[PDB]
Design a protein around this ligand. Structure first.
Ligand SMILES: Cc1csc(-c2c(NC(=O)C3=C(C(=O)O)CCCC3)sc3c2CCC(F)(F)C3)n1
Length: 130
């Protein structure tokens, strides 16, 4: 839809702090902090696929809106994830060990804007079309 396409990371703010708040260790934060992923989003019927491709690590999720699924995150958390569409925004929550983080993806002008919240830390990652 509005989200479908191949997107390339152009900016990131507070990603190291966001990863620290998740409990991510130094080596993995060093890898993630300097990654400039592509995000490839596609839809086939009820199923949406989001691939994140980067030099040192790829991940992929496929999901139906409002249906919880198991996810292994890039930092190796085993989480229960639910993604919904709310006022044009894809809202993802990941739940594990009584904690949660939210990842919201929204389209603004030319950009795909990704807001990641963990406790008091808010990170903003912006992608543009490849
Ligand atoms: C939590 C955590 C630890 S590490 C890591 C992570 C990447 N996270 C992303 O891109 C993320 C988003 C996005 O912008 O799509 C939005 C959601 C949040 C997370 S990308 C990438 C790594 C490490 C390995 C790598 F090879 F460096 C490449 N996420």
């Amino acid at each position: 839809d509005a989200f479908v396409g191949t997107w390339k990371l152009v900016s990131s703010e507070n990603f190291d702090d966001y990863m620290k708040e998740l409990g991510v260790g130094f080596a993995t934060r060093k890898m993630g902090g300097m990654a400039k992923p592509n995000c490839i989003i596609s839809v086939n019927g009820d199923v949406i696929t989001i691939k994140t491709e980067s030099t040192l690590k790829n991940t992929e999720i496929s999901f139906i809106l409002g249906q919880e699924f198991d996810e292994v995150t890039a930092d190796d958390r085993k989480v229960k994830s639910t993604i919904t569409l709310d006022g044009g925004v894809l809202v993802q929550v990941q739940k594990w060990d009584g904690k949660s983080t939210t990842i919201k993806r929204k389209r603004e002008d030319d950009k795909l804007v990704v807001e990641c919240v963990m406790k008091g830390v808010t990170c903003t990652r912006v992608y543009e079309r490849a």
